[model samples]
Target: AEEFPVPNGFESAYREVDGVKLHYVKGGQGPLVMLVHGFGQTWYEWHQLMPELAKRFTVIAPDLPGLGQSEPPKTGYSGEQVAVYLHKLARQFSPDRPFDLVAHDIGIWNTYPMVVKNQADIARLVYMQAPIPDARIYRFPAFTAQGESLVWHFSFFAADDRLAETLIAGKERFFLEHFIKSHASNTEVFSERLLDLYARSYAKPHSLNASFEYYRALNESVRQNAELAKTRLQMPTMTLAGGGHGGMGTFQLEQMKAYAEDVEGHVLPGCGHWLPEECAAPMNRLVIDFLSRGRH
Candidate 1:
């Protein structure tokens, strides 16, 4: 933990959740505020935002199974299943009190089920840069140049074969750079050192496929999410999306409105899909304020 680039005061933690040895970073001493990251990144992605939130809330930023130092699940990878894993980790800290939640990219896919299964446990929800898996994924066009740029990876990563890992075997850095740059609006948000870390993280053996596991088994998530969406969320929910090229724009906002009863969000101008890092200043304020309000 001390050797890693983990934020100050936060130490690396590990626990057996449903037999899966999970690796996470934990610190602070109040109501829990969990940060969940998605594809092409690790717990390190939140290194910047963790300390700020840690000042007040006990922060736990986990590497979803097999993504970073965490061990892979023995069984299948489904959003519903990962939801249970994360919920178990959250309750381990906060226990009885309902704590705030923040999720980015496919992180939303896993945690979305947590709020759905039991809205009472989560006090607030922050959906950032990604949508909950549903039928609408099929509607996201992948034909046009712009459409392909954004959604083409949906099918590519979901391929039944191990082609994703095979082709990206050694070219992890090359692919990640393009992927991150293409989706980001600022273009300069991710530093050279930042990209190197993400690249090396995915370069680990079978690591790329682990990130793609959720996409490969996406059908189960879409099915479950569609069913769960039937009951809209009662808790206060906030959405954050980027307005720059390749960003979700108002798409995630509209999607959340369908499943959340009370929602508020922002379309960060010139902020691409990497909102956490791309707009850390504004995003941090937005997240901290929304979550802090629920505390008092």
Candidate 2:
């Protein structure tokens, strides 16, 4: 945990949720903002934004049940199941009050279902970088002209566990470095120190498999997302995506237009997939302004 240190106020800890020892970090004061991270990272990814957000709102950054110091979940990895788990976890902070949510990459899949099912329990939402899974995901291209995948890892991670697991087992750092960099235009944001921090946790036993389970259970997540969208989310939602090379550009915001009834977002110029790290300044400002919009 020391390797991935944060500002003075933040501290790392764990809580038992549905049989999994869910790891998280929290600090700051006032209303709650639950930050959810995607694959290849843990709650540590928020080390940059947590302090900034913490200045006004109490922030809780959880490791998504199988990454970082958290244990593998006993329940399952479907978007719906993970949603249920996180729903319960966040409620622990403000049992009767609604909390805000910020999710990146695969984190959206896990958190979206519960947000849809329990819309009233959430005050606002900020989903960055990734598209919400739905039937529409099937149409994404396998690769772009640069040989980067539009959705290549989806099928690979979902492959029968043994395959990708075996290939990536001993090379977690190398694999993750390439995987993360391939999608990022702001390569400087990822320092050797930061990369090593994520690599350490991911290289742990069963961690890789647990991360893949989110992908392995994609079909169920897709179904849950599609069905949930049928009713449409009424909560104010903000979509943040990257506009630089290898970024999804406006892809995610465009999708949110259909899934959310009231959506406002920005496709950050020259940014890439890792918004929390690559575009922390604008991302943090947008998040604070959006979440604090009507707090008075």
Candidate 3:
């Protein structure tokens, strides 16, 4: 597809589900490889890795409902709700063979619930640059007074649509600027096209409200997963952390142990939280190797 070019081939589609059309990119043919992007991001996060990954198996990355070319639907806002929608998507894509799920940042938050609830039709999982609620020990704040303050954006998202709409509509540029700074090596590194892409995406109707709904459901998803601890991951789970701006390498590995059983952890050196963008080669190598193992 022109939007998502794979070395061999790629295809784009808009599927109507749960009330809106979701935009997705696909390449190759076989068992599915699903890529879920994080907060304020679309399927574009997987751009660099798509061609390479498509070489091995079918690679599917969605713009996510309300975040990319998909119609900005007000419903399906929460992580749980989003996961439910994705679960349906996975089933539709591969009813017989389970897919391999890879997600980063807020995308991890959405998928974690599916994994914990055993609702995912995934053979294996890769979680990048996200938190494990049960592993939080220190009261350290993520942004301000509270610990895990970095996640306050999720809190703001969880609020009602009206509140988030008003707060972000005026400061869209500010949010974009700050998000780029926090995620990349430097805020200015991103091109004008990238800026316009994200700006236009969030500016779409119902987009702002849907973003807030993600935050509003973060707490609820956490609770849902906690209640679901009885069921462990039936497949191999890998959590990779980036060194530069994400969690401390050793601490993140230790925390992964607390949440995932059969989980292996790796930390990419000289990279930031945006692994696919910052460290695509190593990430793709790891993901391809892991998913190939599941095929057997």
Task: Give each model a TM-score.
Answer: 0.96, 0.96, 0.85
Model 2: residues >4 Å from true position, as ranges? 1-3
| Candidate 3, poorest ten consecutive residues by summed lDDT | 133-142
Model 2 / residue 294 / CA error / Å: 3.0
What lDDT does candidate 3 reach at residue 237? 86
Q: Cα lDDT for residue 130, model 1?
A: 83
Error of 3 at 175 (Å): 2.0
Better-scoring candidate (lDDT), 1 or 3: 1
Q: What TM-score does model 2 achieve against the real structure?
A: 0.96
The residue ranges of model 1 lying beyond 4 angstroms of the native Cα positions read 1-4, 145-148
On lDDT, the stronger of 1 and 2 is 2
Q: Order of candidates by lDDT, top first?
A: 2, 1, 3
Highest lDDT against the true fold, candidate: 2
| Superior candidate under TM-score, 2 versus 3 | 2
Model 2 C-alpha lDDT versus the unseen true structure: 0.86
Off by over 4 Å in 3: 1-8, 72-75, 132-149, 159-164, 186-189, 246-248
Residue-by-residue lDDT tens digits, candidate 1, 95-210: 99998899999899888888888788998899898878988788877677543357779888888668788888889999999999988888787788879878888788867778
